[PDB]
Coordinates of C-alpha atoms in Angstrom, one line a residue:
Chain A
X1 CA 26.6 -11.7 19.4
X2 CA 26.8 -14.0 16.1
X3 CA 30.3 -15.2 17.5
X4 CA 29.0 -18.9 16.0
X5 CA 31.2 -17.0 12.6
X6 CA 34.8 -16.4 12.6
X7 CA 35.3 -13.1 12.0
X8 CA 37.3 -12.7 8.1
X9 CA 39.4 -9.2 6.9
X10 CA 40.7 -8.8 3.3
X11 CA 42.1 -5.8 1.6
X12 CA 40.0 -4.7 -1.2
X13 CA 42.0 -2.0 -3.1
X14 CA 43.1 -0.2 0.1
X15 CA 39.8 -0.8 1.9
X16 CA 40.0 -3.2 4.8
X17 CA 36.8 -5.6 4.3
X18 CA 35.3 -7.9 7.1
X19 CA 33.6 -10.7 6.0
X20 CA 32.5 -13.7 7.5
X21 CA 31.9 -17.2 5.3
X22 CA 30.8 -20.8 5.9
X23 CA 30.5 -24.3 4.2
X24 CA 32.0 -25.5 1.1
X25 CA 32.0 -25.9 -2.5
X26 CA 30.2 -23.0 -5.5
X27 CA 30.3 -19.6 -4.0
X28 CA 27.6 -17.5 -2.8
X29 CA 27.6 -13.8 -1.7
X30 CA 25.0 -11.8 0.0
X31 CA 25.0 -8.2 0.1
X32 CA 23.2 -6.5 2.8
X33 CA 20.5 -3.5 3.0
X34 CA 21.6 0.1 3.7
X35 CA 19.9 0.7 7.1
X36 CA 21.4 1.8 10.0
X37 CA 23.9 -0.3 11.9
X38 CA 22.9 -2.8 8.9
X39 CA 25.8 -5.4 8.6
X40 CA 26.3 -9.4 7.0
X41 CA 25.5 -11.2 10.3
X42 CA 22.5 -8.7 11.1
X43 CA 21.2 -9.8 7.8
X44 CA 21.8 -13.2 6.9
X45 CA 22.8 -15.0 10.2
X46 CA 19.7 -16.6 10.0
X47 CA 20.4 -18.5 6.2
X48 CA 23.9 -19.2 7.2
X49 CA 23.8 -22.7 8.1
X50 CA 20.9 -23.8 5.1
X51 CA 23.5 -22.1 2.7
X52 CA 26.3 -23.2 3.8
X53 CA 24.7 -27.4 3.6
X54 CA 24.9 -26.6 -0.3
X55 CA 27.4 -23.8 -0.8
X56 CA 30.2 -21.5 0.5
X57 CA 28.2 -18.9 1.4
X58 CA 30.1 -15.6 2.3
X59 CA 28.4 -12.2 3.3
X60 CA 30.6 -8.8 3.9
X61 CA 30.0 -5.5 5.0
X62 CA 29.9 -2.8 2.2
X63 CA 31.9 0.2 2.3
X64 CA 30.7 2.8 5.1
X65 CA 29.1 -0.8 7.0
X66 CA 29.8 -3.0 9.9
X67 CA 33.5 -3.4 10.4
X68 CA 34.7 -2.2 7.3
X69 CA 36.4 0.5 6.2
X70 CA 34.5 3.3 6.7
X71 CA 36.6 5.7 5.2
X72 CA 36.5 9.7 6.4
X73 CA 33.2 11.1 4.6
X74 CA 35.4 14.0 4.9
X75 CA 37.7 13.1 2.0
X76 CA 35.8 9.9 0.6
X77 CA 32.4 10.0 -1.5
X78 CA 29.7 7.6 -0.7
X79 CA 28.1 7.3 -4.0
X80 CA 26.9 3.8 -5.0
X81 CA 30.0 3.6 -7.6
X82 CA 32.0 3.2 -4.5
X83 CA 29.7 0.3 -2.8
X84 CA 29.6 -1.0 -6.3
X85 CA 33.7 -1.4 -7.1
X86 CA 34.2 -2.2 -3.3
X87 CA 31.4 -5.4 -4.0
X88 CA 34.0 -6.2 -7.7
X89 CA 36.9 -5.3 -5.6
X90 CA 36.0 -8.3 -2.7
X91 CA 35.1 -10.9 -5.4
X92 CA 38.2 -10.4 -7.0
X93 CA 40.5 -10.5 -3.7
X94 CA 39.1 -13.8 -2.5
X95 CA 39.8 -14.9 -6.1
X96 CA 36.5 -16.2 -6.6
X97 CA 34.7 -16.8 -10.4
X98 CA 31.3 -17.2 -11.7
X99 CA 29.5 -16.8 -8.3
X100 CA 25.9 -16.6 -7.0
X101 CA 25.0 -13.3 -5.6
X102 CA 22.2 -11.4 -3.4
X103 CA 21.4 -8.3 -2.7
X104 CA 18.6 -6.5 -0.1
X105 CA 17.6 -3.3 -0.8
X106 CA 20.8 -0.9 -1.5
X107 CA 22.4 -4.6 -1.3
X108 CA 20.6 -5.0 -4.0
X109 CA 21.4 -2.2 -5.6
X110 CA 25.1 -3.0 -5.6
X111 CA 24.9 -6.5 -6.6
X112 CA 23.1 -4.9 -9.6
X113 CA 25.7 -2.7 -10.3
X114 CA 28.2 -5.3 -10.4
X115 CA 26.6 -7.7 -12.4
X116 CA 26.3 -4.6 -14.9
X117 CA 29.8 -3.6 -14.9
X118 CA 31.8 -6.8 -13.8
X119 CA 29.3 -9.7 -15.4
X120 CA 32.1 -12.1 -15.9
X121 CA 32.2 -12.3 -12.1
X122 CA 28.2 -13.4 -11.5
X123 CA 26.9 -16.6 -12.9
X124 CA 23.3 -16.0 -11.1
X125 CA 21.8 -12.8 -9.7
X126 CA 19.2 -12.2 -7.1
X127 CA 17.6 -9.2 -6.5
X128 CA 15.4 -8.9 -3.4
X129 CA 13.2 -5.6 -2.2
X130 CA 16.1 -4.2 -4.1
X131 CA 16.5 -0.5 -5.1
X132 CA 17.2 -0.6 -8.5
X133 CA 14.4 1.8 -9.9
X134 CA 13.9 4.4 -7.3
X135 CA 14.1 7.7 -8.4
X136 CA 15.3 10.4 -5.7
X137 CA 11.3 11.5 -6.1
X138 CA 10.5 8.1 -4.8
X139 CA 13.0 8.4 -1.6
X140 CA 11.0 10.5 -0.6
X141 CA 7.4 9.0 -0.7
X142 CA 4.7 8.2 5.7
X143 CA 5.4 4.4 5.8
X144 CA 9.0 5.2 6.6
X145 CA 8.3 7.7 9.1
X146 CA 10.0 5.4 12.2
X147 CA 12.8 5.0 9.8
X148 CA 13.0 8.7 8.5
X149 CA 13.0 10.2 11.9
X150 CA 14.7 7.4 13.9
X151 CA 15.9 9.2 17.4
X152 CA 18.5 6.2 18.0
X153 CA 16.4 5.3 20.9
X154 CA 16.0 1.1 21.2
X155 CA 12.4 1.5 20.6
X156 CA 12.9 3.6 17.9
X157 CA 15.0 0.9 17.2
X158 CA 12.1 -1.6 17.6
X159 CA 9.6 0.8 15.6
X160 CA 11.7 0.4 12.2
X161 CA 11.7 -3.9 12.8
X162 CA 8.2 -3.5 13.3
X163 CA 7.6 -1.1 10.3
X164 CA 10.2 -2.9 7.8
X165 CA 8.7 -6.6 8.6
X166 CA 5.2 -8.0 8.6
X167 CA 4.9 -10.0 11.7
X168 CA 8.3 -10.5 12.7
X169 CA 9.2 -10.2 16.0
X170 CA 12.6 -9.8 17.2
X171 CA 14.6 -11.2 20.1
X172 CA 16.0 -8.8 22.6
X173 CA 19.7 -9.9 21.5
X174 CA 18.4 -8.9 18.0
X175 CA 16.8 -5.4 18.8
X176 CA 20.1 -5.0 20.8
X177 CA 22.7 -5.7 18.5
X178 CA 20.7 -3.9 15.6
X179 CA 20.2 -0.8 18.3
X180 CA 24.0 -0.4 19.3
X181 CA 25.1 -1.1 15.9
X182 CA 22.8 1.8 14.2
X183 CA 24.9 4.1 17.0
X184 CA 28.5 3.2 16.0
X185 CA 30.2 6.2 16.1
X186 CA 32.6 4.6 13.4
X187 CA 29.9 4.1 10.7
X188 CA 27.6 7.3 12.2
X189 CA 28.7 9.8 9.5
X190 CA 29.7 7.4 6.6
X191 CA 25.9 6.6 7.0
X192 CA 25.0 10.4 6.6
X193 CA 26.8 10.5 3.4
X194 CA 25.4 7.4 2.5
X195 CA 22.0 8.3 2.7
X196 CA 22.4 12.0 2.1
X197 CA 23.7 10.5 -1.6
X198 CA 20.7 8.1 -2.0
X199 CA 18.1 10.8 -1.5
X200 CA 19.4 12.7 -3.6
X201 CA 20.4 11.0 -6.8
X202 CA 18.6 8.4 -6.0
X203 CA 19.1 4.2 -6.2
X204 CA 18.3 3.0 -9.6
X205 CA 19.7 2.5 -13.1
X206 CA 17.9 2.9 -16.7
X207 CA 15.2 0.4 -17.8
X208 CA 17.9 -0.4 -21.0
X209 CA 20.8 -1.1 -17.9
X210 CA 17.8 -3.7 -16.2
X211 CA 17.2 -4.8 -20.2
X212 CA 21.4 -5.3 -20.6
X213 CA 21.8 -8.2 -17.7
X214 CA 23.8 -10.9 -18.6
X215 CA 23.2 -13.7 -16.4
X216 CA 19.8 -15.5 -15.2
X217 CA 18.1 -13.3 -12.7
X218 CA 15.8 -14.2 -10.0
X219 CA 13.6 -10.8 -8.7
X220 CA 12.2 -11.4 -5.0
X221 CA 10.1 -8.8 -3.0
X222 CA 7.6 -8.9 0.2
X223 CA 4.0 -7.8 -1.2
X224 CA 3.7 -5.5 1.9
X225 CA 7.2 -3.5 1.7
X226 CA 7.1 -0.3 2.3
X227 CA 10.5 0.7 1.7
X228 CA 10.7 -0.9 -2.0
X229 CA 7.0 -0.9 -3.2
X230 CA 5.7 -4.1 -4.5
X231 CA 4.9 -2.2 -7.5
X232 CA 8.7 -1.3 -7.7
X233 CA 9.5 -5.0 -7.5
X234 CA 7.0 -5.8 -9.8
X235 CA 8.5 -3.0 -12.5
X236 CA 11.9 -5.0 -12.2
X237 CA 10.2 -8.7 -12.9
X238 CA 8.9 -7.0 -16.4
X239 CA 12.3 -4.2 -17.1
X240 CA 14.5 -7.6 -16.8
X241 CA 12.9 -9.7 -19.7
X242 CA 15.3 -13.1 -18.3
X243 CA 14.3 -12.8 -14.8
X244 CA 12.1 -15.0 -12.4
X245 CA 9.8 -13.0 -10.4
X246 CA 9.1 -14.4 -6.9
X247 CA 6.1 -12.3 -4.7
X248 CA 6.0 -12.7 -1.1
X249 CA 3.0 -12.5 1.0
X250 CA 2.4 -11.4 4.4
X251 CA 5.8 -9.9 4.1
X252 CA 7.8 -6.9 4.6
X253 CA 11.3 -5.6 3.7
X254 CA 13.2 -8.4 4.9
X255 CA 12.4 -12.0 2.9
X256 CA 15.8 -13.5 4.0
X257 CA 15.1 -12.4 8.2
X258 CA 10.8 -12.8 7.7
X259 CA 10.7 -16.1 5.6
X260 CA 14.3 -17.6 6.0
X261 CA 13.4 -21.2 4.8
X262 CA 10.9 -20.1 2.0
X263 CA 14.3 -17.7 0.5
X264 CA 16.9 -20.1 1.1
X265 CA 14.6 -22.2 -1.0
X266 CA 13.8 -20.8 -3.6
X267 CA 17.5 -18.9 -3.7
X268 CA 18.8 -22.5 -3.7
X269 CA 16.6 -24.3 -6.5
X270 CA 17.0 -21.1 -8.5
X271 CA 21.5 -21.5 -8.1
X272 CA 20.7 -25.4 -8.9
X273 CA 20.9 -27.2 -5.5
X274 CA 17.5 -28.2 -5.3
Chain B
X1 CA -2.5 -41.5 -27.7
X2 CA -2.2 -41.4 -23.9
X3 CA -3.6 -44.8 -23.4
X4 CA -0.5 -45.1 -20.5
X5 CA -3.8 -43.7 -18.6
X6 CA -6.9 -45.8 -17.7
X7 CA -10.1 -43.5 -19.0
X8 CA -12.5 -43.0 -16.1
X9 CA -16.1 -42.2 -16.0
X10 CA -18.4 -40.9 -13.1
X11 CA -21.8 -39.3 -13.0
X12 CA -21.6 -35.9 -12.0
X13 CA -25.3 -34.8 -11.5
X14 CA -26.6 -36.0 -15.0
X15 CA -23.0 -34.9 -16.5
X16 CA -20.8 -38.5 -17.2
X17 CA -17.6 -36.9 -17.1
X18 CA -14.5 -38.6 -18.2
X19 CA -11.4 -38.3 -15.7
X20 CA -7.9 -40.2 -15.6
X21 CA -5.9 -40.1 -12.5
X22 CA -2.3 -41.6 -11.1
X23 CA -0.7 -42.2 -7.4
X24 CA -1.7 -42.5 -4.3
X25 CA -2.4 -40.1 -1.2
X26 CA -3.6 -36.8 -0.9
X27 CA -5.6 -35.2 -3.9
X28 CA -4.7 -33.1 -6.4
X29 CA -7.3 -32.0 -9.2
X30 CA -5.8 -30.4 -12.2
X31 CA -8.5 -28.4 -14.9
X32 CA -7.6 -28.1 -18.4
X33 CA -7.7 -24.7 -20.1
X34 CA -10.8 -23.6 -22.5
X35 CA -8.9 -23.8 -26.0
X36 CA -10.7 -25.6 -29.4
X37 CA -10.3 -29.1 -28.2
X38 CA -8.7 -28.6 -24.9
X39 CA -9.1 -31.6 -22.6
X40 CA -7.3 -33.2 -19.4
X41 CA -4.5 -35.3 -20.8
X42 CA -3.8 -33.0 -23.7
X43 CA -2.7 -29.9 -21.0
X44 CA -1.6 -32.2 -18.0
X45 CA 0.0 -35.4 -19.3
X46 CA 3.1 -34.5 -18.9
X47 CA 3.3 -33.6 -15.3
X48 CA 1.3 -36.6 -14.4
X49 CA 4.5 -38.4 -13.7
X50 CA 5.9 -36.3 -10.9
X51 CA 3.0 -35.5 -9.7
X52 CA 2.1 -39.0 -9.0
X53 CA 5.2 -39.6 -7.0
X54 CA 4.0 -37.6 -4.3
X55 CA -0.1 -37.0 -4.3
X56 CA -3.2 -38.8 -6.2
X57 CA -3.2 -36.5 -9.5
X58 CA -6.7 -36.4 -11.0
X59 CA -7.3 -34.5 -14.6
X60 CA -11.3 -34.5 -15.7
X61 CA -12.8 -32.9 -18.8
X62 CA -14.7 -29.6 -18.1
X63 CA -18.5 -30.0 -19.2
X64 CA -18.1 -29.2 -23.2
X65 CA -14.8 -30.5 -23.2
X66 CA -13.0 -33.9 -24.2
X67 CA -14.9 -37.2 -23.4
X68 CA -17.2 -35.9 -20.6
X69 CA -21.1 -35.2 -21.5
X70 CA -21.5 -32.4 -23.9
X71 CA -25.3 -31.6 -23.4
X72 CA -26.5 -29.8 -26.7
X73 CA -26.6 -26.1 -26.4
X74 CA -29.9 -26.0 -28.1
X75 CA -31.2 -27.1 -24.4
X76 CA -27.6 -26.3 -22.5
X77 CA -26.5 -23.0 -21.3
X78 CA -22.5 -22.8 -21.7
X79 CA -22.0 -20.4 -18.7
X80 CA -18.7 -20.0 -16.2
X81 CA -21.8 -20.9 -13.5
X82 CA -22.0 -24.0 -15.5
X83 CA -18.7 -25.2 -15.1
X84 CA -17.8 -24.0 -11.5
X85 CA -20.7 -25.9 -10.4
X86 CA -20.0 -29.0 -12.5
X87 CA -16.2 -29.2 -10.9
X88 CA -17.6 -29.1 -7.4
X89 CA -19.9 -31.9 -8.6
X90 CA -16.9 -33.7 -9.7
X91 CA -15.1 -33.3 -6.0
X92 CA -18.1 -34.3 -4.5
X93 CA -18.5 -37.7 -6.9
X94 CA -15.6 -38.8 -6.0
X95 CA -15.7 -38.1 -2.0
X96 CA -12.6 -35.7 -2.0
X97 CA -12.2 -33.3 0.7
X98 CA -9.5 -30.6 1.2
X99 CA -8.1 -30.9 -2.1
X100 CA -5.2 -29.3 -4.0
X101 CA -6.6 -27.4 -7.3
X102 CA -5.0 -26.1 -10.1
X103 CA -6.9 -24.4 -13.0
X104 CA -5.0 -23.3 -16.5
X105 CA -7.0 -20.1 -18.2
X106 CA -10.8 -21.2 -18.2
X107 CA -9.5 -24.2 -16.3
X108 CA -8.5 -21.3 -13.5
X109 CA -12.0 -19.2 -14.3
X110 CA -13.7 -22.6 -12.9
X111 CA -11.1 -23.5 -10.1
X112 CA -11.2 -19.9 -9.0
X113 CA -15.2 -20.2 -8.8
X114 CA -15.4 -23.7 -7.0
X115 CA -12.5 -22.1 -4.2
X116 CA -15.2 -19.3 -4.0
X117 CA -18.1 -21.4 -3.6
X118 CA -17.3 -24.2 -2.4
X119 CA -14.1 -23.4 -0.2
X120 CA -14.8 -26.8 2.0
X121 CA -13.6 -28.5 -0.6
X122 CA -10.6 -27.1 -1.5
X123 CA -7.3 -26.8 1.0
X124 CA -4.9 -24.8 -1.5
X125 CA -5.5 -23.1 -5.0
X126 CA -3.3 -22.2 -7.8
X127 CA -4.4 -20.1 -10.7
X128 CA -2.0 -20.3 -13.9
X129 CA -2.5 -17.9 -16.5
X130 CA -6.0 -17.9 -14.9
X131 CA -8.7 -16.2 -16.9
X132 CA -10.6 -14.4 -13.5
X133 CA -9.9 -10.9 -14.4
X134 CA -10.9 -10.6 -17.9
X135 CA -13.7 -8.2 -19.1
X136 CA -15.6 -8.7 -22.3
X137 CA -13.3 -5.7 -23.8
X138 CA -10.3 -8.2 -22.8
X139 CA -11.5 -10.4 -24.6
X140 CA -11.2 -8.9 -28.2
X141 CA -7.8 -6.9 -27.4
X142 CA -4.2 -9.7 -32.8
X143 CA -1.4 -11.5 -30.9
X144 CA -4.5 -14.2 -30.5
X145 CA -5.0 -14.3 -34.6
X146 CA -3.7 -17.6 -35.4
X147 CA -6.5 -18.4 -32.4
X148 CA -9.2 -16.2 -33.1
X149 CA -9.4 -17.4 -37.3
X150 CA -8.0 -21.4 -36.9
X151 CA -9.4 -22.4 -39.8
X152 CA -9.2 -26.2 -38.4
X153 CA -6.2 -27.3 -40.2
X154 CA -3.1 -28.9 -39.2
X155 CA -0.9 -26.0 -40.1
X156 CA -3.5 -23.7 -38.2
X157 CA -3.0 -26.0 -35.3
X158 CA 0.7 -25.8 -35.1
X159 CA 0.2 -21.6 -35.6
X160 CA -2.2 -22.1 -32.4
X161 CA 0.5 -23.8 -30.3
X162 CA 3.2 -21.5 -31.8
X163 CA 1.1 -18.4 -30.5
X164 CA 0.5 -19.6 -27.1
X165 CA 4.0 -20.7 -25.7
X166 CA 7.4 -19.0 -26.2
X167 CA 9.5 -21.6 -28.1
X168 CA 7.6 -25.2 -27.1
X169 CA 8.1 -27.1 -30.1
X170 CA 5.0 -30.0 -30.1
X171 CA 5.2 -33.7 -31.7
X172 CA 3.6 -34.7 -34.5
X173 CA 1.6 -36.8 -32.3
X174 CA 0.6 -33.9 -30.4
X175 CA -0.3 -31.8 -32.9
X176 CA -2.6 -35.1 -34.7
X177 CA -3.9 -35.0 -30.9
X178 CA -4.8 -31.6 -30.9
X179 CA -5.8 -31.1 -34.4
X180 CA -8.0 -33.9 -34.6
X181 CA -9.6 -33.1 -30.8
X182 CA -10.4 -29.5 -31.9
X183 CA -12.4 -31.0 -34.7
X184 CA -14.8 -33.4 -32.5
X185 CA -18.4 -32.7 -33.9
X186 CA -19.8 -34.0 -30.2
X187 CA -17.5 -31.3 -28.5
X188 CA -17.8 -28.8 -31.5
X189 CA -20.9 -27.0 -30.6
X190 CA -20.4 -26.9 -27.0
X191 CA -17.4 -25.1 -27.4
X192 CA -18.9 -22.3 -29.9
X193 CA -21.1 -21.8 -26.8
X194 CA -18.3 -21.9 -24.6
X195 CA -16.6 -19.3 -26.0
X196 CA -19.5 -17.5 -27.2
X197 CA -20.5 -16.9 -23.4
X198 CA -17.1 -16.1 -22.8
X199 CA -16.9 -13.3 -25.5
X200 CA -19.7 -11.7 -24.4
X201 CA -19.9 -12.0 -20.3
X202 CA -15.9 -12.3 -20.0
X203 CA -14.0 -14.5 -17.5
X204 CA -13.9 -12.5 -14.3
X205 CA -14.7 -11.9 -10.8
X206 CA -14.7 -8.4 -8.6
X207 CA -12.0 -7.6 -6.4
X208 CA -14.2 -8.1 -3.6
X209 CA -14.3 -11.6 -4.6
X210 CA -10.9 -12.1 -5.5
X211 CA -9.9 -11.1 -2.1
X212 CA -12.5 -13.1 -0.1
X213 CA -10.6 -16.7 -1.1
X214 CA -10.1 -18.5 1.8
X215 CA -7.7 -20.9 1.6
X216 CA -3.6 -20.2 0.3
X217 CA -3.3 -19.0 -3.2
X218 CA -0.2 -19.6 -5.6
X219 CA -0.9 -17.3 -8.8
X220 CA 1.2 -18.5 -11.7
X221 CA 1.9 -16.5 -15.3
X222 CA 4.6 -17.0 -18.2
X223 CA 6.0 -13.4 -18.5
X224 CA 5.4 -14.0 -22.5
X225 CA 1.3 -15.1 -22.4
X226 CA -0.6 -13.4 -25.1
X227 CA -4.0 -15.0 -23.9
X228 CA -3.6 -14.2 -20.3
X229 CA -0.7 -10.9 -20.3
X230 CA 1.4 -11.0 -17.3
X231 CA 0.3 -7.6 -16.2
X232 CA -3.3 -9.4 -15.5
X233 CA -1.4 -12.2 -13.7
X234 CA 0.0 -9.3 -12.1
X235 CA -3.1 -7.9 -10.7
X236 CA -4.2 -11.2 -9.3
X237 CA -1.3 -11.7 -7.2
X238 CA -2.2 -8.1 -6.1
X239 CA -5.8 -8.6 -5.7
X240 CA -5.8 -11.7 -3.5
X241 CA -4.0 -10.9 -0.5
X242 CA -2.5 -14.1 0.8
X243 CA -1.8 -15.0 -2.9
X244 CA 1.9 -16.2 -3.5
X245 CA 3.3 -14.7 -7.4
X246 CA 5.4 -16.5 -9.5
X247 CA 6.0 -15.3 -13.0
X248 CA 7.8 -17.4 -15.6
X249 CA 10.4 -15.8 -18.1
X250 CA 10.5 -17.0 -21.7
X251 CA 7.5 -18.4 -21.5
X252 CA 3.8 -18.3 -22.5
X253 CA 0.7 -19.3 -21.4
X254 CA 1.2 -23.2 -21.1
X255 CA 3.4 -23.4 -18.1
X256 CA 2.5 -26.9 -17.3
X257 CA 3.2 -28.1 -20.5
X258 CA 6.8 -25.0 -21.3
X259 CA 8.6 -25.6 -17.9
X260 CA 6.6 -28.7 -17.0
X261 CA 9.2 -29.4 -13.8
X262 CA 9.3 -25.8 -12.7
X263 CA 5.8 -26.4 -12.7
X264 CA 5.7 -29.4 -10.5
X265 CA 8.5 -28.6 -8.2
X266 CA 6.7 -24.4 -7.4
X267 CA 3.1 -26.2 -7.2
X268 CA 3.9 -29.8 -5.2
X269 CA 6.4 -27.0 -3.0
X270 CA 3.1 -25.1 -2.3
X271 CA 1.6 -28.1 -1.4
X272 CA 4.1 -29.2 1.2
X273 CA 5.6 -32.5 -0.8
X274 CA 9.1 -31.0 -1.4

């Protein structure tokens, strides 16, 4: 599936990075969520070709993702310092400047983190149901219950679609590839580490890092996520006193995948295309 | 000023009420806020332009307000009922059906009510720093001084505009408007009723009411509103279910006139012309 995009591989600082990249002109990066099997393609396919009418738009797998690098959890940490210098370490090997960039969830996360520590690289930032603020307390706090105890089964599989969307229902090739990817064997115990981190120090940084931004800012969020509480979303609009809040309704934890046209949108107005 | 507009006049069940309007096709109805000499052209003027492009763009005066019928409030009860019912007397004047609405503050408090009961009427509603959740207590609770004690000159005028928007920097001609409107002795005495009502019942409706709007919502709020804080704009967007949220950054509680094409492009967007 999703052979429509060439497949891409860089080196970024001895980490072997697949990305994949389309149309022409100011960059754009997207950063996907931290699910399981979560990848570019599984995340953005779908805004691809709207992007890409208007911009370069490039998405890659983070470290411990897709068809990069996972490296050996048994000699590499997967703390979100590592996601965070992989994302810098990418921008810089494709030599790109000034760039838009979105992140989902711990996508989100990451693309906070670099705009923090590498804000020459990031002209405009876009944070969407993105864990910024979540205290290990709040990773673990019912509604993530297909998620939490996901047996790798493809209804399981279907259960967390159905549990991280609103009303969005997915084709077979989608609940498929997202299914078989969540099992790679590969990416299985960089995962563990990955998550095993998250819960317990948590995915956030200070309300005077979410003050210290830089750039403009554009805060999106689904009114009806349960992974990254509206309320969460909501804290970020008022901690980042620049940013552009954008609520969602009828929507889950997935604004690119549940309203594709409605994000590429207002993504595209807010970078200055529209 | 604002002659570029043809003054209108219709009988709205005993209530002349002065209206200008520009374009052609579907139509919009925009309602001023409920500030000391507050009228149609004065809060809308500037978007009329682009809005005209794309949809008939009609701006009235409230009852009290501007050049519509200001019935003495030794025989007149100034009441929120009183203007909700006075709006859907104006949609009804002039034959519109499944309108666009957009309410500023008061302006909101009555669009809000005619979406609630008269919802025939009304095909898509946006509240913008929209006075519906706002208890008596609200209404006394020092960032609204230069409003609460305008002593009715010029320099009180400019310290008005000042403390409602974020760095909006009037005319002279707009503050002569403004000044001089706010000093109307026809309009005067309504408006001491006006806000004397206000004061004392507040600008609000239940949750339960707030949720039971039936057509799509767009809630609107600059991050920086003194009159209208965002964390009430906040609570509509949670309180109305379908209800889209966009908050504004650096700005107060004029969005229309602050970020007057952000505020065409996010309203005529909702209204499916872009």
């Amino acid at each position: 599936m999703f052979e429509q995009f060439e497949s891409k591989f860089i080196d970024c600082d001895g980490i072997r990075t697949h990305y994949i990249e389309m149309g022409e002109g100011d960059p754009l990066v997207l950063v996907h969520g931290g699910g399981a099997g979560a990848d570019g393609r599984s995340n953005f396919a779908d805004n691809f070709p709207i992007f890409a009418r208007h911009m370069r738009v490039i998405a890659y797998d983070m470290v411990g993702f897709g068809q990069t690098d996972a490296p050996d959890p048994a000699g590499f940490a997967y703390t979100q310092a590592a996601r965070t210098d992989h994302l810098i370490s990418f921008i810089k090997a494709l030599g790109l400047s000034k760039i838009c960039l979105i992140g989902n969830s711990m996508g989100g996360t990451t693309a906070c983190g670099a705009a923090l520590k590498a804000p020459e690289l990031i002209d405009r930032l876009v944070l969407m149901g993105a864990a910024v603020n979540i205290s290990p307390d709040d990773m673990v706090a019912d509604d993530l219950a297909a998620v939490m105890s996901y047996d790798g089964s493809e209804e399981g599989m279907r259960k967390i679609i159905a549990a991280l969307t609103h009303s969005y229902q997915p084709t077979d090739d989608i609940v498929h590839y997202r299914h078989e990817a969540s099992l790679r064997p590969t990416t299985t115990a960089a995962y563990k580490a990955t998550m095993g981190w998250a819960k317990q120090n948590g995915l956030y940084y200070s309300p005077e890092q979410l003050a210290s931004l830089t750039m403009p800012v554009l805060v999106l969020g689904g009114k009806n996520d349960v992974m990254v509480p509206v309320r969460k979303v909501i804290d970020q609009i008022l901690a980042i006193p620049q940013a552009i809040g954008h609520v969602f309704p009828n929507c889950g934890h997935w604004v690119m995948i549940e309203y594709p046209e409605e994000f590429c949108t207002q993504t595209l107005h807010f970078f200055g295309k529209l």
